[PDB]
Swiss-Prot record:
Portion held of the full protein: 96 to 134 of 171
Organism: Mus musculus (Mouse)
A single MF term (Gene Ontology): growth factor activity
Descriptive protein name: Teratocarcinoma-derived growth factor
GO cellular component: cell surface; cytoplasm; extracellular region; extracellular space; Golgi apparatus; nucleus; perinuclear region of cytoplasm; plasma membrane
Annotated S-S bridges: C4-C22, C17-C38, C20-C29
Protein role: GPI-anchored cell membrane protein involved in Nodal signaling. Cell-associated CRIPTO acts as a Nodal coreceptor in cis. Shedding of CRIPTO by Tmem8a modulates Nodal signaling by allowing soluble CRIPTO to act as a Nodal coreceptor on other cells. Could play a role in the determination of the epiblastic cells that subsequently give rise to the mesoderm.
Localization (cell): Cell membrane; Secreted
Main location (coarse class): membrane
UniProt keywords, alphabetically: Cell membrane, Disulfide bond, EGF-like domain, Glycoprotein, GPI-anchor, Growth factor, Lipoprotein, Membrane, Secreted, Signal
The keyword 4Fe-4S belongs to this UniProt entry's keyword annotation: no
Length: 39
């Protein structure tokens, strides 16, 4: 019962790198240059 993704942080520990979006069928979960210093 969903119409998109969500939020993420493929990082763990005190880090803020990697994400998702919420679109109707486009972009699940990826970083996408979110922080060019941390994966």
């Amino acid at each position: 019962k969903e119409h998109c993704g969500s939020i993420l942080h493929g990082t763990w520990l005190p880090k803020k790198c990697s994400l998702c979006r919420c679109w109707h069928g486009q972009l699940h979960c990826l970083p996408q240059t979110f922080l060019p210093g941390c994966d």
